[PDB]
Short mmCIF file of C-alpha atoms in Angstrom, two decimals:
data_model
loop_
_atom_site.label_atom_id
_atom_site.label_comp_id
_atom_site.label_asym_id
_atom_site.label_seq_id
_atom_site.Cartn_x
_atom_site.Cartn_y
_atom_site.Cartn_z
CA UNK A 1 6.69 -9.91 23.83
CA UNK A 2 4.02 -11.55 25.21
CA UNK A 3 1.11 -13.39 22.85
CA UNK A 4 -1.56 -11.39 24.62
CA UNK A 5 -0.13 -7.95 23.88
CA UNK A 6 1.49 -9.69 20.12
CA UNK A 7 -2.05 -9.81 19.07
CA UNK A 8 -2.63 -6.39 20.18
CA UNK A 9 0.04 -5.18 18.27
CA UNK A 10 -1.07 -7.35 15.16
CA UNK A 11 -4.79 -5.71 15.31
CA UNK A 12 -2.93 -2.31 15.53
CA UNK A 13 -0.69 -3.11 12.67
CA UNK A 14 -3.63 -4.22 10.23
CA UNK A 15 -5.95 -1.29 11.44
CA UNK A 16 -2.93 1.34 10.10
CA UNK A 17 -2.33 -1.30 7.08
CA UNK A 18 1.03 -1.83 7.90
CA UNK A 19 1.19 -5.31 6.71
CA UNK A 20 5.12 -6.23 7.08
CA UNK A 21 5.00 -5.43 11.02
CA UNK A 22 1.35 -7.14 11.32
CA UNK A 23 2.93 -10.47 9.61
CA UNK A 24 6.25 -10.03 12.28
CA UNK A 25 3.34 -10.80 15.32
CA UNK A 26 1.85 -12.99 13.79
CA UNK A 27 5.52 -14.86 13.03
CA UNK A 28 6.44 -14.25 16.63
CA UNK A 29 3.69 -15.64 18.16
CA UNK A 30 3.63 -18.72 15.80
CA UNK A 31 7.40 -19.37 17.22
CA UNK A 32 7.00 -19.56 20.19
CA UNK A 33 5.16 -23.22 19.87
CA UNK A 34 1.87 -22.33 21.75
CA UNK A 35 -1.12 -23.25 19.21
CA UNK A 36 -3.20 -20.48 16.96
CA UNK A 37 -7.01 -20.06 18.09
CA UNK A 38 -9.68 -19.70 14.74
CA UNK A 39 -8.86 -15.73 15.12
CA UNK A 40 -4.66 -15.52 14.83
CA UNK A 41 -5.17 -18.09 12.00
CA UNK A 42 -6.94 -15.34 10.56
CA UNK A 43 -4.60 -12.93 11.46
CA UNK A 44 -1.60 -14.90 10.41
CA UNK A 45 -2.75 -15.26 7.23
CA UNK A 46 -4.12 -12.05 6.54
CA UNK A 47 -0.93 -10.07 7.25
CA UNK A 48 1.25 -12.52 4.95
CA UNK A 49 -1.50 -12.92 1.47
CA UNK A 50 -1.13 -8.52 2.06
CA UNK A 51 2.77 -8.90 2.16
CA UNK A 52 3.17 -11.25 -1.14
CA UNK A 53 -0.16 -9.76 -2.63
CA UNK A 54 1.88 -6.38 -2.91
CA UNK A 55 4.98 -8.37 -4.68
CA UNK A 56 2.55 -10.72 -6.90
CA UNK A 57 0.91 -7.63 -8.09
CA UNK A 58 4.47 -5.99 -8.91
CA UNK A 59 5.96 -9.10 -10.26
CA UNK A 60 2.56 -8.80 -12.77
CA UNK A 61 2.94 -5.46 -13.61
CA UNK A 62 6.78 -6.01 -14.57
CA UNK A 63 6.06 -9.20 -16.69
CA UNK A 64 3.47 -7.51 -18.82
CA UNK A 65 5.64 -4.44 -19.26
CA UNK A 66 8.91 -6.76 -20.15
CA UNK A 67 6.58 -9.10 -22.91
CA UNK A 68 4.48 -6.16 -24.12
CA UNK A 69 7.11 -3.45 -25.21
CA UNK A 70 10.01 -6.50 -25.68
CA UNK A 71 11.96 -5.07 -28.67
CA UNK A 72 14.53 -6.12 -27.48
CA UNK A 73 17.41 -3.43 -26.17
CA UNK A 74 19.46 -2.38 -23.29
CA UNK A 75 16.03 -1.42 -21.78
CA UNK A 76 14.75 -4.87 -21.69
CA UNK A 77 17.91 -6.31 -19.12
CA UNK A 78 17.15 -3.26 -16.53
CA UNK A 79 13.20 -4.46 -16.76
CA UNK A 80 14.55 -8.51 -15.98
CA UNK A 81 16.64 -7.45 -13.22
CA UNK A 82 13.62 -5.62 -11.68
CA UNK A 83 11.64 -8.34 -11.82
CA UNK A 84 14.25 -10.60 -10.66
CA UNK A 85 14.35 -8.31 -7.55
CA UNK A 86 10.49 -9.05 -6.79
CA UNK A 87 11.15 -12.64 -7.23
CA UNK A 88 13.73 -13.11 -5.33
CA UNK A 89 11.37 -10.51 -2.13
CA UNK A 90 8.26 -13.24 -3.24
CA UNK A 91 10.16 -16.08 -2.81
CA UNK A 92 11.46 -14.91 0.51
CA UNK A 93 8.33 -14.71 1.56
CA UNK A 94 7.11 -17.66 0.91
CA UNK A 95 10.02 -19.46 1.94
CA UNK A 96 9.45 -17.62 5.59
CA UNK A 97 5.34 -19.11 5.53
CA UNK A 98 6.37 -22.53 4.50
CA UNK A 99 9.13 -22.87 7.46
CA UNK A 100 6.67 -21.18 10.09
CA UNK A 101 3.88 -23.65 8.28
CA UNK A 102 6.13 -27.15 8.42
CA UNK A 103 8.43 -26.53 11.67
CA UNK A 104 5.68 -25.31 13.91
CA UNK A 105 1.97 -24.60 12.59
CA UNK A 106 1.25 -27.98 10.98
CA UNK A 107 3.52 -29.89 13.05
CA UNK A 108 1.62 -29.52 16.13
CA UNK A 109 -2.00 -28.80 14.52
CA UNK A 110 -4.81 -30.52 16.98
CA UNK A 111 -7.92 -30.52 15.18
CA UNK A 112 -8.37 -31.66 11.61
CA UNK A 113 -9.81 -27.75 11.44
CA UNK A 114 -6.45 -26.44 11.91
CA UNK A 115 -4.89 -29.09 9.39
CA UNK A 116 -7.05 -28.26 6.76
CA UNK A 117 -6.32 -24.82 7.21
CA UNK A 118 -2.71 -25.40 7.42
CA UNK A 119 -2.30 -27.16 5.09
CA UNK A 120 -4.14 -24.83 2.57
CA UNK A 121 -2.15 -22.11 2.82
CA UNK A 122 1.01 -24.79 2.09
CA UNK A 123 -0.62 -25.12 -0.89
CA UNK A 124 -1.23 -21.43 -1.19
CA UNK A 125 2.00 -20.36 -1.16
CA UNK A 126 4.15 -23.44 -3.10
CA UNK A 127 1.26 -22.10 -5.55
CA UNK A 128 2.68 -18.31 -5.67
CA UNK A 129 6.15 -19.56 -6.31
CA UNK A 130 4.99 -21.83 -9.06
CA UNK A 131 3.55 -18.39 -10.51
CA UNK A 132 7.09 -17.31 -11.04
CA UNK A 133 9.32 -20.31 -11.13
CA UNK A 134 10.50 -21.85 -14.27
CA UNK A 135 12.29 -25.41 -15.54
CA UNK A 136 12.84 -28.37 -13.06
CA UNK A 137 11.67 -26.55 -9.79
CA UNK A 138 8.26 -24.96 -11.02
CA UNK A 139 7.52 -28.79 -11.94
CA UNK A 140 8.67 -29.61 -7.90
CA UNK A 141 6.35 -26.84 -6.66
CA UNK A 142 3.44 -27.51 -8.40
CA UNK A 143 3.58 -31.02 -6.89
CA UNK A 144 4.40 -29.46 -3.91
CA UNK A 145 1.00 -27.14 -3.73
CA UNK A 146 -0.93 -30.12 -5.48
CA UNK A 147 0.11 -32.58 -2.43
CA UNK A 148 -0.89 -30.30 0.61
CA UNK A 149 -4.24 -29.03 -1.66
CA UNK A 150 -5.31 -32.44 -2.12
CA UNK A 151 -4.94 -33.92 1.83
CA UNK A 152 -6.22 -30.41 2.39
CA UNK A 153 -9.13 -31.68 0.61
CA UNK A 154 -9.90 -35.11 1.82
CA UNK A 155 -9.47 -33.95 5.01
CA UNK A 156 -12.10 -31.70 4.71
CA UNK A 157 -14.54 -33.65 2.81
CA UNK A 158 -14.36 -36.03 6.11
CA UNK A 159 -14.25 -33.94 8.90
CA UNK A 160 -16.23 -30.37 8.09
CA UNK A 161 -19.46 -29.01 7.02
CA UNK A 162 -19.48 -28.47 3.55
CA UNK A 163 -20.67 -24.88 4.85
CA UNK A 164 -17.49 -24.15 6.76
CA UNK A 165 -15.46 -21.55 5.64
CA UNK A 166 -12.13 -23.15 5.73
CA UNK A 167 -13.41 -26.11 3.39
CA UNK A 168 -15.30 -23.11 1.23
CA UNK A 169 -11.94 -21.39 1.16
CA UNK A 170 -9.63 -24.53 0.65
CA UNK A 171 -12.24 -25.02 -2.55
CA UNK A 172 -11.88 -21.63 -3.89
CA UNK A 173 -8.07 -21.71 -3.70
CA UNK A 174 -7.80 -25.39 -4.94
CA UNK A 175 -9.71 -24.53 -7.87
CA UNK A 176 -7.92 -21.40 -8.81
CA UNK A 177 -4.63 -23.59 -8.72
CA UNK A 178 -6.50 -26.03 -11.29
CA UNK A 179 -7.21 -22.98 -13.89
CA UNK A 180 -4.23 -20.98 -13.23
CA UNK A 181 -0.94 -23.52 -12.53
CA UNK A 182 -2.67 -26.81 -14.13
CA UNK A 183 -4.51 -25.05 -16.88
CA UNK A 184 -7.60 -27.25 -16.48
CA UNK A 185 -10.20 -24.65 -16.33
CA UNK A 186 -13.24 -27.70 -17.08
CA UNK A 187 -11.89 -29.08 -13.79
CA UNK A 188 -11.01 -25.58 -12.01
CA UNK A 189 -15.08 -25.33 -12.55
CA UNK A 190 -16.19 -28.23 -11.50
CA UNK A 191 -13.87 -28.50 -8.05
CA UNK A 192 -15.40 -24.72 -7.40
CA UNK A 193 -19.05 -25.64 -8.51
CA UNK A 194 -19.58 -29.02 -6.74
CA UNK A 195 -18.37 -27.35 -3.05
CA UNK A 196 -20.90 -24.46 -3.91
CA UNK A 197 -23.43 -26.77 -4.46
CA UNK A 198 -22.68 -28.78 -1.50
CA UNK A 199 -23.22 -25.69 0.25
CA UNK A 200 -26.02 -24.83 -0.84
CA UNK A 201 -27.62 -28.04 -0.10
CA UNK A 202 -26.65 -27.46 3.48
CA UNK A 203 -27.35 -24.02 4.27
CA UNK A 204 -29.48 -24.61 7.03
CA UNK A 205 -26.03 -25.88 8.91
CA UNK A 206 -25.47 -22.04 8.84
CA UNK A 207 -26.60 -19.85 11.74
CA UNK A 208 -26.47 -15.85 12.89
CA UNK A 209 -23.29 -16.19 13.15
CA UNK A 210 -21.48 -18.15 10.44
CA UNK A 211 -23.68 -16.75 7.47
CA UNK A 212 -21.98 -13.80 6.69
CA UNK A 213 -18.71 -15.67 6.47
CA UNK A 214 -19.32 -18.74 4.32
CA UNK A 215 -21.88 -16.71 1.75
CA UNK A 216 -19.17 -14.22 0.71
CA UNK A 217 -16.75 -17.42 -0.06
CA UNK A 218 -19.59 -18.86 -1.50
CA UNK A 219 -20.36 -15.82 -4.10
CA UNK A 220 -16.71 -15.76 -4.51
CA UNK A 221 -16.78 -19.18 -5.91
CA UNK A 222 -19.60 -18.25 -7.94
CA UNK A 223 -17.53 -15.29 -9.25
CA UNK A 224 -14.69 -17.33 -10.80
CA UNK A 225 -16.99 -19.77 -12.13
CA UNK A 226 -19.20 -16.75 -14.06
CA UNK A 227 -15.32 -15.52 -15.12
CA UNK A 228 -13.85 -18.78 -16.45
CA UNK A 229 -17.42 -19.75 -18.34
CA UNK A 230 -17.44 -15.96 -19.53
CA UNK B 1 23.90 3.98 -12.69
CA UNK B 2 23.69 7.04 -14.95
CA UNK B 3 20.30 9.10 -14.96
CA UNK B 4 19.01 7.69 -17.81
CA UNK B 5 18.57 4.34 -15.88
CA UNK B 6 17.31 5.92 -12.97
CA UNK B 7 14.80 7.54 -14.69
CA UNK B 8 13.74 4.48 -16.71
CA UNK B 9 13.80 2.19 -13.28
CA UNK B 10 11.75 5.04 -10.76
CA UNK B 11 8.85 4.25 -13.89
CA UNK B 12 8.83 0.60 -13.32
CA UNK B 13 8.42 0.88 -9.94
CA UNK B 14 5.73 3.22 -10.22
CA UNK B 15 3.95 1.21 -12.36
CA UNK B 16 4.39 -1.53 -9.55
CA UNK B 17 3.27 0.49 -6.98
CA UNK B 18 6.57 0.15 -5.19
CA UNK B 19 7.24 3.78 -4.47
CA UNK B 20 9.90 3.11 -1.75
CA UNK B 21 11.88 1.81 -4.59
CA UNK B 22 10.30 4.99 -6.80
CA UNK B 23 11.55 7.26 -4.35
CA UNK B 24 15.42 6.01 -3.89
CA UNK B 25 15.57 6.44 -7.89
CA UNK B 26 14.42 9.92 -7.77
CA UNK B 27 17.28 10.17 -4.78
CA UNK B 28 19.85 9.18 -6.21
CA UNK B 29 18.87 11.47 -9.32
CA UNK B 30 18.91 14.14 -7.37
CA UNK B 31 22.19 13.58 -4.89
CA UNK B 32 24.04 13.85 -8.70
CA UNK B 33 23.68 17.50 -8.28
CA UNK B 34 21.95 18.46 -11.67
CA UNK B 35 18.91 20.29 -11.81
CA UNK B 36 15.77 18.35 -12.44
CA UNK B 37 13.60 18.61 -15.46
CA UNK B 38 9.64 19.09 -14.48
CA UNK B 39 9.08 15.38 -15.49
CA UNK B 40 12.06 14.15 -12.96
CA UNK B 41 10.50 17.01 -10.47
CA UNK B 42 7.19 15.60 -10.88
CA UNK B 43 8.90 11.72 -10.31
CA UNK B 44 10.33 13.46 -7.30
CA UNK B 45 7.39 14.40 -5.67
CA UNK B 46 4.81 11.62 -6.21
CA UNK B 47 7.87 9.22 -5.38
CA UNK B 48 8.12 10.84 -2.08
CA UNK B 49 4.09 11.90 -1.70
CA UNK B 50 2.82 7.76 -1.35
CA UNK B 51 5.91 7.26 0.63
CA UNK B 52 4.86 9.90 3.40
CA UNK B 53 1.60 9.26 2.90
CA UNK B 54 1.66 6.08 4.64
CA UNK B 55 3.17 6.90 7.56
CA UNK B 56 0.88 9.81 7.45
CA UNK B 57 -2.67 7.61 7.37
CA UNK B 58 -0.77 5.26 9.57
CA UNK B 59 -0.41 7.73 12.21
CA UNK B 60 -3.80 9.22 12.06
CA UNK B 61 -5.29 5.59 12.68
CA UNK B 62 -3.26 5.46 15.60
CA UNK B 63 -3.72 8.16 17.15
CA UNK B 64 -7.61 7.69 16.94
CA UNK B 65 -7.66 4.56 18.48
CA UNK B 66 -5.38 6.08 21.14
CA UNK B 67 -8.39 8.58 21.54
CA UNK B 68 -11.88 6.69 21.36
CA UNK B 69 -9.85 4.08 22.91
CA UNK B 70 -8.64 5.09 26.38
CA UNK B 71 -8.76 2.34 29.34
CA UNK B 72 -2.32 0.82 31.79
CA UNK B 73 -0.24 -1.52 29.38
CA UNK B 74 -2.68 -1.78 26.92
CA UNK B 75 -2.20 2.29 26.10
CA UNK B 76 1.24 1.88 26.16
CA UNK B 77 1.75 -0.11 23.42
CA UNK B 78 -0.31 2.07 21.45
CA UNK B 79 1.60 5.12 21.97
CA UNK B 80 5.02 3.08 21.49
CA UNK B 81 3.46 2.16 18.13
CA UNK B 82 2.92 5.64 17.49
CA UNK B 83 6.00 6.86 18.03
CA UNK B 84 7.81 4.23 16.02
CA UNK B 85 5.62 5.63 12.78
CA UNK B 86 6.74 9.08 14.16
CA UNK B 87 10.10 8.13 13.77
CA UNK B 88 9.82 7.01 10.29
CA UNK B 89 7.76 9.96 9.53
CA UNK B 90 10.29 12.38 10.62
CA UNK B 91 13.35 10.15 8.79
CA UNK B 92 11.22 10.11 5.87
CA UNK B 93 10.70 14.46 6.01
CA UNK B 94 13.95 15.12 6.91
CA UNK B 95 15.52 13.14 3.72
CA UNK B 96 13.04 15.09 1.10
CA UNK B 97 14.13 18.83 3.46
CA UNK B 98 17.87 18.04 2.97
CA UNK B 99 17.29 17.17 -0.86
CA UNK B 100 15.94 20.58 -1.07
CA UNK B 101 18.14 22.89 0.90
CA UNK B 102 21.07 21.04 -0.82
CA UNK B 103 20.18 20.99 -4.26
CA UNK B 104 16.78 21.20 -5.26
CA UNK B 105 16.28 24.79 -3.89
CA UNK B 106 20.13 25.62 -4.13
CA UNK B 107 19.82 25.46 -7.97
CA UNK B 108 16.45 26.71 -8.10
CA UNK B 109 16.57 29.57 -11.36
CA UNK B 110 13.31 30.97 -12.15
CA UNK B 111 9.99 31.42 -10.13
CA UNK B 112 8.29 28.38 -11.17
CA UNK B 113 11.22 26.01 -9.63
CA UNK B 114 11.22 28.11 -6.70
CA UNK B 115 7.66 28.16 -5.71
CA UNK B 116 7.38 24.34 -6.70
CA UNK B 117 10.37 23.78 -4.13
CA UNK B 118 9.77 26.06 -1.91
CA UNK B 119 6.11 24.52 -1.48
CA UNK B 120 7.86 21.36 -0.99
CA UNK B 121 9.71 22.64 1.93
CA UNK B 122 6.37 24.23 3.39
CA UNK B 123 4.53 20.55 2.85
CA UNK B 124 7.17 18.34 4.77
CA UNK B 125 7.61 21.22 7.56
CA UNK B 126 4.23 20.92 7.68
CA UNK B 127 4.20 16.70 8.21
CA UNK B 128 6.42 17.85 11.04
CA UNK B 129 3.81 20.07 12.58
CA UNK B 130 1.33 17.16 12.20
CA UNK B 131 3.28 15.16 14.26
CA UNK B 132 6.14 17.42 16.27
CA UNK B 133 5.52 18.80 19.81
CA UNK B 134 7.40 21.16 22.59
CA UNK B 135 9.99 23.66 21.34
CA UNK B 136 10.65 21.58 18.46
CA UNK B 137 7.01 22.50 17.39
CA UNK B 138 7.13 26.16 17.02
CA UNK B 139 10.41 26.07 14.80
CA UNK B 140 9.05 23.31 12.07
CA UNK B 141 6.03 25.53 11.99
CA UNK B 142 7.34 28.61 11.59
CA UNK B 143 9.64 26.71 8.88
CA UNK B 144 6.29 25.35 7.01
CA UNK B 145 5.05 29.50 7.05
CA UNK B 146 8.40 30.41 6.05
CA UNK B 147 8.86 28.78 2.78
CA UNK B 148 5.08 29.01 1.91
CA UNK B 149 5.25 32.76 2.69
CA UNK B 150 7.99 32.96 0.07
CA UNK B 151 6.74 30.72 -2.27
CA UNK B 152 3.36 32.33 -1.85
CA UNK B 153 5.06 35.87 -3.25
CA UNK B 154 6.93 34.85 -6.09
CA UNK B 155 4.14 32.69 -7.24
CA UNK B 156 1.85 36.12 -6.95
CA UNK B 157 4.12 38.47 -8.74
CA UNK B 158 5.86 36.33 -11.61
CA UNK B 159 2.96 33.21 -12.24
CA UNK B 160 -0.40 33.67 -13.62
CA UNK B 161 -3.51 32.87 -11.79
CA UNK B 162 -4.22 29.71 -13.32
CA UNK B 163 -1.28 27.85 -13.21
CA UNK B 164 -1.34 24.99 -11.02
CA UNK B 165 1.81 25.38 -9.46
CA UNK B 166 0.55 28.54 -8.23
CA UNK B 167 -3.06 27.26 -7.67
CA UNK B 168 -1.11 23.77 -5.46
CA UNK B 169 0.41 25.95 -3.68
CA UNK B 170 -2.75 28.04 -2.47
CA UNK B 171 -4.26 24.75 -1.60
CA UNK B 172 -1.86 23.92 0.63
CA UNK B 173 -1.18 27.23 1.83
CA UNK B 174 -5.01 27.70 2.92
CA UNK B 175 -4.82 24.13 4.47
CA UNK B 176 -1.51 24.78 6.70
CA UNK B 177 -3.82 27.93 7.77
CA UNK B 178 -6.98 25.45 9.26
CA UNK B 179 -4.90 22.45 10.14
CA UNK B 180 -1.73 23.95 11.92
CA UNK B 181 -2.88 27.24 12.34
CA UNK B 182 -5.97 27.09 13.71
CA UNK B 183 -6.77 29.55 12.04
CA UNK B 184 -10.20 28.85 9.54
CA UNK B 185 -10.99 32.76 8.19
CA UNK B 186 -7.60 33.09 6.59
CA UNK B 187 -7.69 29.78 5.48
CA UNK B 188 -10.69 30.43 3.59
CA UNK B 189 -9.85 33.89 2.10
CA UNK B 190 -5.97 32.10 0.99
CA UNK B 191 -8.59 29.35 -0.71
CA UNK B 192 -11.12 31.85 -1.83
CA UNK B 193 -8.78 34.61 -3.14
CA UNK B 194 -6.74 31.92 -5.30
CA UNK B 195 -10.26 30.51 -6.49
CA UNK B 196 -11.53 33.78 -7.79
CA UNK B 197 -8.19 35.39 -9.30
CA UNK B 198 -8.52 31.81 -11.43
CA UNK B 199 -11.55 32.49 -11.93
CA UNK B 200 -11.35 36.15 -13.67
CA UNK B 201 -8.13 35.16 -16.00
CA UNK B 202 -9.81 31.62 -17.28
CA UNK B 203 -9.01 32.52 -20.41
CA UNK B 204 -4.83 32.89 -19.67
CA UNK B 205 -5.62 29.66 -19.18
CA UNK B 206 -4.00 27.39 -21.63
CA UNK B 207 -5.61 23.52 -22.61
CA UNK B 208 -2.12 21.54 -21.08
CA UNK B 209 -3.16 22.69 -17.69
CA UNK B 210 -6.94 22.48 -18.01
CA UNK B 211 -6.51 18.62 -16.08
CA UNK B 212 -4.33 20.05 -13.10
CA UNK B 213 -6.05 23.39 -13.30
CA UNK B 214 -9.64 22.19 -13.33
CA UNK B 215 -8.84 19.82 -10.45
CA UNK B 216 -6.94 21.77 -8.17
CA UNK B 217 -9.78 24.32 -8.38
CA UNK B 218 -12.01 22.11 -7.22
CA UNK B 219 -10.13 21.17 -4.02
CA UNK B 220 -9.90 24.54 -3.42
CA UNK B 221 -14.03 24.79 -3.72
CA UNK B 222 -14.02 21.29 -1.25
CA UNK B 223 -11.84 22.45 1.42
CA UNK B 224 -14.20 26.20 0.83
CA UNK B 225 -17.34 23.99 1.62
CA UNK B 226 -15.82 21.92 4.48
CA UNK B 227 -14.50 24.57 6.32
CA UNK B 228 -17.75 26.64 5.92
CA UNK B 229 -20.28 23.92 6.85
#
């Protein structure tokens, strides 16, 4: 189909919440090479955090039941293989982001806006499989979202407002890898609390426009920091 | 896998949320041919009630924007996407209709499994009518009336007033009156009439059903307002 009438389709798909079909435009148009305008970056990565959200939030729910309740019994190996069964749906996933990410997104990014976007959600989604990996390759992915987090970040820092809502976003994801995969919550709270001041500190860079978006990324920030000082 | 299994499994993935994988469980209990208890029943139907329920919100989004939204090709990819939930609407109907007339309803003993599967068969007739059209129309509504009629007579003569199978069943009933039917005065006296028989046997009402009861009673009094206002 065409990329006009793919983003048509996309809109339609996330207005009836059907996530898996909104994530398929968005796939198609990535492949076929032409690059992603500030809005189907949105859209591409709306329709996939809604397709692993719904297996993250599964893969929790299964964990918690398999610890809690773990005396162990025959009813213990049906709860692993269930879970095993998410991982194996979140991994797909991911696996499908990463390859649309490194053979086509941030191969032939333009702007260092669409970099640092880019390569955010790289670090986004190595991050959800080092949620549920374990031994020698949960080491390999947390060095895998640490490296595209971190040129994420320096990129940023050089080329964007402290205001902008990618570098605001990149912030509030790099910090949440910090308390949850590094388990450095002093650090998790300072990465989150320096770009919020930052931001305030430049909030006359924001306009009628761009308010709305950077001050809800902005209070989010401010919500994990209340949360992991709480 | 055995039932036990199944049973154990259609849990987890209702504590996950994933009732695809909820409802397949509850299949596959009920393709062994053995009648279901009221806690695999209830499984059953909640498996099955967030799968349509999707493709049932899905479609209604659809065909709104289809509506406040008319322009050429633009409008035709809307309706294309509104079939293709269609489709999986009616596969999804169809599946939980065969389960029924095949062995839910075949071993159906006493009234209460009867009017709680025959109330079934009147709800996903009734998904049809939401959606169906033509010739095809008149026959999956008359199919939603049929069952409900039937269920609606048992559940008079052999269930008490305040039982909520009887009182779920009213709620629908009333509400394939004013949504297929077109038809808002019976609609109100089916809702009204169930209301106030519950109402003068409260005390045949026993504490286990005082959550379902209590609710169901209410959405009887919503739909009451709505339709009134």
């Amino acid at each position: 189909m065409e990329k006009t009438e793919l983003i048509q389709k996309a809109k339609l798909a996330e207005q009836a919440e059907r996530y898996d079909d909104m994530a398929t435009c968005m796939k198609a148009v990535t492949e076929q090479g032409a690059e992603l305008s500030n809005e189907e970056r949105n859209l591409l990565s709306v329709a996939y955090k809604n397709v692993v959200g719904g297996r993250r939030s599964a893969w929790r729910v299964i964990s918690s039941i398999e610890q809690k309740t773990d005396t162990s019994d025959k009813k213990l190996q049906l709860i692993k293989d269930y879970r095993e069964k998410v991982e194996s749906e979140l991994r797909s996933i991911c696996t499908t982001v990463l390859e649309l990410l490194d053979k086509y997104l941030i191969a032939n990014a333009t702007n260092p806006e669409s970099k640092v976007f880019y390569l955010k959600m790289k670090g986004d989604y190595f991050r959800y499989l080092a949620e549920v990996a374990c031994g020698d390759d949960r080491k390999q992915t947390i060095d895998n979202s640490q490296g595209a987090y971190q040129e994420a970040f320096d990129i940023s820092k050089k080329e964007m407002q402290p205001t902008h809502p990618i570098r605001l976003g990149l912030a509030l994801n790099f910090s949440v890898f910090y308390y949850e995969i590094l388990n450095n919550p002093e650090l998790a709270c300072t990465l989150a609390k320096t770009a919020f001041d930052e931001a305030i500190a430049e909030l006359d860079t924001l306009n009628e426009d761009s308010y709305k978006d950077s001050t809800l990324i902005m209070q989010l920030l401010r919500d994990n920091l209340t949360l992991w000082t709480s």
